[PDB]
Amino acid sequence: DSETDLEALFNAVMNPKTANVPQTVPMRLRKLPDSFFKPP
Amino acid sequence: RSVASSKLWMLEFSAFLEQQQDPDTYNKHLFVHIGLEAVDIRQIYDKFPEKKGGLKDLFERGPSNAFFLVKFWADLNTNGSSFYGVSSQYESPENMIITCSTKVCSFGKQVVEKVETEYARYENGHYSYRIHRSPLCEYMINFIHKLKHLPEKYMMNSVLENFTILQVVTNRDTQETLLCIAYVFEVSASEHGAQHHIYRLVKE
Numbered sequence: 055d056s057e058t059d060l061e062a063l064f065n066a067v068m069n070p071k072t073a074n075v076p077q078t079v080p081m082r083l084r085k086l087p088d089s090f091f092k093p094p
Numbered sequence: 095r096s097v098a099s100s101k102l103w104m105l106e107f108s109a110f111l112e113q114q115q116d117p118d119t120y121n122k123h124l125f126v127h128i129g130l131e132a133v134d135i136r137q138i139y140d141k142f143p144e145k146k147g148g149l150k151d152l153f154e155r156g157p158s159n160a161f162f163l164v165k166f167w168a169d170l171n172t173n174g175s176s177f178y179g180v181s182s183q184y185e186s187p188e189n190m191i192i193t194c195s196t197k198v199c200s201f202g203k204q205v206v207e208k209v210e211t212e213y214a215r216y217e218n219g220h221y222s223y224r225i226h227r228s229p230l231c232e233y234m235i236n237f238i239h240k241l242k243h244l245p246e247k248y249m250m251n252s253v254l255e256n257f258t259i260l261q262v263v264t265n266r267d268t269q270e271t272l273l274c275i276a277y278v279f280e281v282s283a284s285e286h287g288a289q290h291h292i293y294r295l296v297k298e
């Protein structure tokens with residue numbers, strides 16, 4: 055099982071070797087409008 | 095009037111940090127502020143609460159014109175005498191009692207909810223509702239702290255990929271969804287500060 059809490063969230067990014075959070079599709083790789091990643 | 099259904103329009107929304115220099119001097123930083131392309135809602139359902147009363151349930155119940163997705167680029171460029179707050183303002187042709195529920199979600203799971211009840215003020219034939227300087231919850235204050243204390247901007251966006259806010263504004267008496275706003279976040283890199291795009295959420 056993965057964890058879903060506040061230390062876990064930042065831990066996952068700060069120390070990716072010990073990450074145990076759910077794995078997901080990055081927003082960039084989803085069917086979303088081009089403007090979604092280009093700020094005005 | 096972008097974030098507007100048939101019954102309610104959100105004219106203003108801002109999250110800010112206000113710092114009291116001295117009793118007469120206050121510095122205010124806006125993290126995000128508001129004050130239409132379509133997005134397939136199925137692409138974002140995983141980032142929000144599921145089951146009864148969750149995003150899918152609310153969307154299916156309708157009306158479909160009440161559903162929005164806001165992408166924020168947040169301005170985190172800011173430094174005992176601090177107030178973290180959120181203010182918002184709404185307008186309606188009707189005098190309703192409204193409830194505003196704001197859910198902070200992480201990997202699609204609800205972490206905290208704030209619930210606010212607002213009453214109408216007559217204003218020029220229409221009615222206004224204001225949520226004035228709602229204190230930001232401790233979770234959000236702590237989240238902002240942790241974000242800013244990460245070494246790299248890329249790390250901040252990585253964290254933010256799985257952090258969302260869902261705002262549901264309801265007619266208290268009838269339980270009709272007046273506005274439902276899904277918020278997604280990145281960090282601003284702009285010289286112009288906080289930015290946003292507003293989208294309509296659609297079924298496909």
Ligand SMILES: *C(=O)CCCCCCCCCCCCC
Pocket residue numbers: 109125126168180196197198206207208229230231232234238259279
């Ligand atoms: C706790 O009670 C607060 C509920 C959520 C308030 C919404 C404020 C929007 C936060 C934007 C700040 C920027 C963080 C990336």
